[PDB]
Design a protein around this ligand. Structure first.
Ligand code: IKX
Ligand code: IKX
Ligand code: IKX
Ligand code: EU3
Length: 207
């Protein structure tokens, strides 16, 4: 499957793509403002994620640091990124269909649109100014808006036992972005697409 990753932000981002125990394609790349990077994701990829990283430094070997979304200091991510990270999430070729969503469960750093480039389903978007409107206690000093699990480490926020409700913090994310997951047990906003669809992830789609 192809994923065209487009940075419409006025700032550079370092895109990342992983399924948690492996890179997808090269795993990461710098995208200056306006740049597009197209990756190939293997069919059947389950639990893949794409995110932006901000304020990164990498040496000539691809090792360094980012202020949001850092994946063990690598340019080319093999692992998931450090919150806060707005997440484009997908599982492909699952009994004939693809499933996509955006999640704020690991916080929000950069606005995003995640849409198919082929027919048969809608896209999803979380493009509101979550960082600017972020509740004081969730603001990340390194940049972004943390989720409450990251900040407080409670069973209720982290849904540790599979029982939790919405919270004042989850409701903030949900109000700003109704079409993204705001907590683990949120009413799903997953979109079913034809199996083997292709996609575009656009950072700062309206920004
Ligand atoms: O993002 C990480 O840091 C990470 C992700 C992991 N994984 C592994 C998967 C795939 C299936 O479990 N997903 N995330 C595992 C570990 C770790 O053991 O330290 N760490
Ligand atoms: O570098 C890692 O693999 C890593 C760093 C982690 N963290 C988490 C923090 C605190 C705030 O994010 N600092 N390092 C957590 C994990 C994991 O759970 O597998 N992995
Ligand atoms: O604590 C972690 O989350 C962790 C520790 C790791 N390791 C591995 C070693 C041994 C030698 O590198 N030390 N910490 C690796 C990972 C990861 O890949 O996600 N995560
Ligand atoms: Eu780890």
């Amino acid at each position: 499957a192809t994923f065209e990753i487009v940075n419409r932000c006025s700032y550079t981002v370092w895109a990342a793509a992983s399924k948690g125990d492996a890179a997808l394609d090269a795993g990461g790349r710098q995208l200056n403002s306006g740049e597009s990077w197209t990756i190939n994701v293997e069919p059947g990829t389950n639990g893949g994620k794409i995110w932006a990283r901000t304020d990164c430094y990498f040496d000539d070997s691809g090792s360094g640091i980012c202020k949001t979304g850092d994946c063990g200091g690598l340019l080319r991510c093999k692992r998931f990124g450090r919150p806060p990270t707005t997440l484009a999430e997908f599982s492909l070729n699952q009994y004939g269909k693809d499933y996509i969503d955006i999640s704020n469960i690991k916080g929000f750093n950069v606005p995003m649109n995640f849409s198919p480039t082929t027919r048969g389903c809608r896209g999803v978007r979380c493009a509101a100014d979550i960082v600017g409107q972020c509740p004081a206690k969730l603001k990340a000093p390194g940049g972004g808006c943390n989720d409450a699990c990251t900040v407080f480490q409670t069973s209720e926020y982290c849904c540790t036992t599979g029982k939790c409700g919405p919270t004042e913090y989850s409701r903030f994310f949900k109000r700003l972005c109704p079409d993204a997951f705001s907590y683990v047990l949120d009413k799903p906003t997953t979109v079913t697409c034809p199996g083997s669809s292709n996609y575009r992830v656009t950072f700062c789609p309206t920004a």
